[PDB]
Amino acid sequence: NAAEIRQQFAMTAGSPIIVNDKLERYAEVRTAFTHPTSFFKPNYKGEVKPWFLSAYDEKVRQIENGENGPKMKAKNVGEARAGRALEAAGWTLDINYGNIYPNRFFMLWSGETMTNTQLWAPVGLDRRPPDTTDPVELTNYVKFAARMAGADLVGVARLNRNWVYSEAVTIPADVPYEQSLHKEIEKPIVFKDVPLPIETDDELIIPNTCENVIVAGIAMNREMMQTAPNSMACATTAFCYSRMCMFDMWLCQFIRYMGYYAIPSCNGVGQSVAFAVEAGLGQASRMGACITPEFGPNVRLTKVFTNMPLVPDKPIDFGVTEFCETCKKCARECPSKAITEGPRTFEGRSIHNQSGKLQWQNDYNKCLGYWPESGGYCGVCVAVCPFTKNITEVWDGKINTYGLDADHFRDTVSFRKDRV
Amino acid sequence: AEKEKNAAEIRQQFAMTAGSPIIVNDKLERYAEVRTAFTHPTSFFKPNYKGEVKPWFLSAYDEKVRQIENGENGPKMKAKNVGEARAGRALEAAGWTLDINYGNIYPNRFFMLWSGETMTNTQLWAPVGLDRRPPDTTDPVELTNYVKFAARMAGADLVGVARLNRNWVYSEAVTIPADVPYEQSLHKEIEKPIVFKDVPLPIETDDELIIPNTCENVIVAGIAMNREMMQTAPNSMACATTAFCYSRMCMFDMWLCQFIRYMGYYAIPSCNGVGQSVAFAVEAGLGQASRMGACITPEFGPNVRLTKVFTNMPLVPDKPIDFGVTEFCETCKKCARECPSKAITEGPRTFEGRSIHNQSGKLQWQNDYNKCLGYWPESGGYCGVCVAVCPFTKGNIWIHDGVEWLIDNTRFLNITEVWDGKINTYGLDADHFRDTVSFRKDRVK
Ligand code: SF4
Ligand code: SF4
Ligand code: SF4
Ligand code: SF4
């Protein structure tokens, strides 16, 4: 009974993230995916390329050699091909591995130009003032909508601006997709007294009225993630990124048609793990992920920012911090030794970490370096974590819609009493 | 003791020998898509509640607005308050986010591209060459297992394979010229023939949509709707589960087409376009046709949406299923009695279409689909009362008698609570989700 467990472990109100007076908002360019010190990696031939192009070279090499992963023979070349075809297809509704550019492509900050909004314009739902301002009813409505939109977990928190990127990585508005990767730029995210989210030439402007963040958990497939670092773990990762994108769009449209505004984000705008912890989805862990009672860390996160009045959820403590202090299994299994075996500190290990918050400090350039080597997105830490509990057998074995598991799907049933 | 329900056993018990179960005669011709009630000039226009004659969906918009202002969730159906009325229409409208003009029917436009070459995902992945490398698997048995696994990842609750029967492919599609932007699309619709020719890849010219003669197979997906919400038909929450499933259909088509392309084959998406989904679903064994005209499945009854993808990927066709729907529909008639427009016949099946909207030459129950569409502006939604009242839509129809499975004949003798009630991811129901579990023996024999 997940509803039992979650109420049993509810904390009193208040962000559980411990900060000091040195904490500053973090520039998105500093992540290992984007920072110039980490973006380039060698491929297996010794050629230095953007990390994902070197990883592509390893995927091709593996298919040619009939492998599903590094030193992991597939049943045959056909099976190797199928795993990479499934992975590539999963990313269909995602731009450049994460949808990070705000107010571009799928991540529009206004619904006005969307084909769906245009078709529905005669009804005027996005221009009519709200008919409901009660946060209790709105919380029930928007959480119901979030489940329809594909969230397996949903939570609400007040927006902590500490976790919003100081500056986003984006592209100029008129740059076509084919030039996007070569024309990424940095752009400040600022808060101002304005009626609606708006982007100028100089700034991404979030209204000061943007009170709340809605955080969704999108469950990955257990059998597929257990093949990490091989291709089927890459495929469940990929499919869930497209599920994230559809969730954001559906939910933003619902909120707009209720008379409020909504900012989608997927992997952009801010740090999902921090939002997820403050919204009570789970607890932060040694590997750096939000660990949930239902899925452990084997769940993806996305979030939507809104002025819709809502009731914040309570943070939860089910003992993850104390379990991680003695466990260290992810740190021992990590192929790049990226994950620390030491205690939590306020001091980042490198430019990629945000200093000023008490956390396990991991070396995320070491992690990214393993991705071209293995030809994937690893995930071994997620796979081995106790809270999460060959490839031919996966393809021949159990599956169900969206990779969900009917042995556990009852755990995410929801009634009004657990929504608000 | 009660035998634990087993959807795979049920499908195995009622499997037929190979062969299209649809009975046809010499009158059969391919059907021009413009003839559907949504598009034909005789049915496209409907009065609104003030008597003004408009495109059907604009007259229905007028009724949605009227209901919200009057605090109603449907025709004569009072909501708890105006905010609840508003919330149901906001959910319905949002559900349609990934669907163009109520069904994604224009082929090779917007989401329904016939080639992946211009897609942002294909461009990002181009260095791997998955869409240019020849197939590494040509064995239909392994391909069927691979593609059905992918189909489940892509959100299908049911998946089946049939050889493509061109009788159900539209003779001419409804589409728009390639230079027309979205905001003009509804004013610029045209017809364009769908033809089969000896070409290597699906291709569109100025004059024709060309499907290769190598396009052997159709993959049909069932996308389950939510039972609690459909039971509110014809009110707004039934409209919302309908809408959300159309966007699920779109995601399914794009995901699966990309998988098939990255396996070295071509793939044509369709959603509500290209051809007649119910006929493909019957031939792929998802279910049986019914009095209301829908495909009734063992797992969901007719409370399931359909989409399909066409491909040259070698595959193993599934067997059709006969679990007695025809004989139950012969005596049931509940959808005909409850239909608010009297669109559904109470008579026998014939080969003769009731009107231009029906394709003559196939043995089916002939329904008046102009009457159906006429109730949509009146009710401000997409009705669905027939789906809601069908006994097969109940979750509880199957019983085991110690020897075999059978249908319980006894089954044939508000919105606030929905918003406050049970829900789960994508509106799926964990009490029944085990019914769609799949292993290799389910996917290919
Ligand atoms: S994804 Fe792999 S390399 Fe990265 S931290 Fe986890 S185990 Fe280590
Ligand atoms: S593997 Fe152990 S130490 Fe690492 S995150 Fe999981 S519980 Fe914590
Ligand atoms: S309501 Fe009765 S007659 Fe109509 S489709 Fe269902 S079983 Fe057939
Ligand atoms: S949708 Fe409604 S009007 Fe149309 S056939 Fe079904 S019950 Fe009749």
PDB file of C-alpha atoms and ligand atoms in Angstrom, chain B residues 290-292 296 328-329 332-336 386 389-392 412, ligand 3:
ATOM      1  CA  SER B 290     -20.415  -5.203 -33.841  1.00  0.00           C
ATOM      2  CA  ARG B 291     -23.878  -3.728 -34.282  1.00  0.00           C
ATOM      3  CA  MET B 292     -22.671  -0.217 -33.397  1.00  0.00           C
ATOM      4  CA  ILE B 296     -15.275  -5.144 -29.865  1.00  0.00           C
ATOM      5  CA  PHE B 328     -24.722 -11.461 -29.135  1.00  0.00           C
ATOM      6  CA  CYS B 329     -25.261  -8.339 -31.250  1.00  0.00           C
ATOM      7  CA  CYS B 332     -28.791  -7.487 -27.805  1.00  0.00           C
ATOM      8  CA  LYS B 333     -29.594  -4.132 -29.502  1.00  0.00           C
ATOM      9  CA  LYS B 334     -28.863  -2.087 -26.347  1.00  0.00           C
ATOM     10  CA  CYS B 335     -26.739   0.439 -28.227  1.00  0.00           C
ATOM     11  CA  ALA B 336     -29.552   0.877 -30.798  1.00  0.00           C
ATOM     12  CA  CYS B 386     -23.150   3.258 -27.523  1.00  0.00           C
ATOM     13  CA  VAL B 389     -23.806   1.025 -22.617  1.00  0.00           C
ATOM     14  CA  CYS B 390     -22.330  -1.950 -24.506  1.00  0.00           C
ATOM     15  CA  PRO B 391     -22.134  -4.924 -22.094  1.00  0.00           C
ATOM     16  CA  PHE B 392     -18.660  -5.746 -23.468  1.00  0.00           C
ATOM     17  CA  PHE B 412     -27.067  -8.656 -21.459  1.00  0.00           C
TER      18      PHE B 412
HETATM   19  S1  SF4 C   3     -24.673  -2.894 -27.120  1.00  0.00           S
HETATM   20 FE1  SF4 C   3     -25.259  -5.007 -27.664  1.00  0.00          FE
HETATM   21  S2  SF4 C   3     -25.842  -4.895 -29.900  1.00  0.00           S
HETATM   22 FE2  SF4 C   3     -24.691  -2.987 -29.412  1.00  0.00          FE
HETATM   23  S3  SF4 C   3     -22.536  -3.447 -29.984  1.00  0.00           S
HETATM   24 FE3  SF4 C   3     -22.742  -3.951 -27.723  1.00  0.00          FE
HETATM   25  S4  SF4 C   3     -23.286  -6.179 -27.666  1.00  0.00           S
HETATM   26 FE4  SF4 C   3     -23.620  -5.450 -29.830  1.00  0.00          FE
END
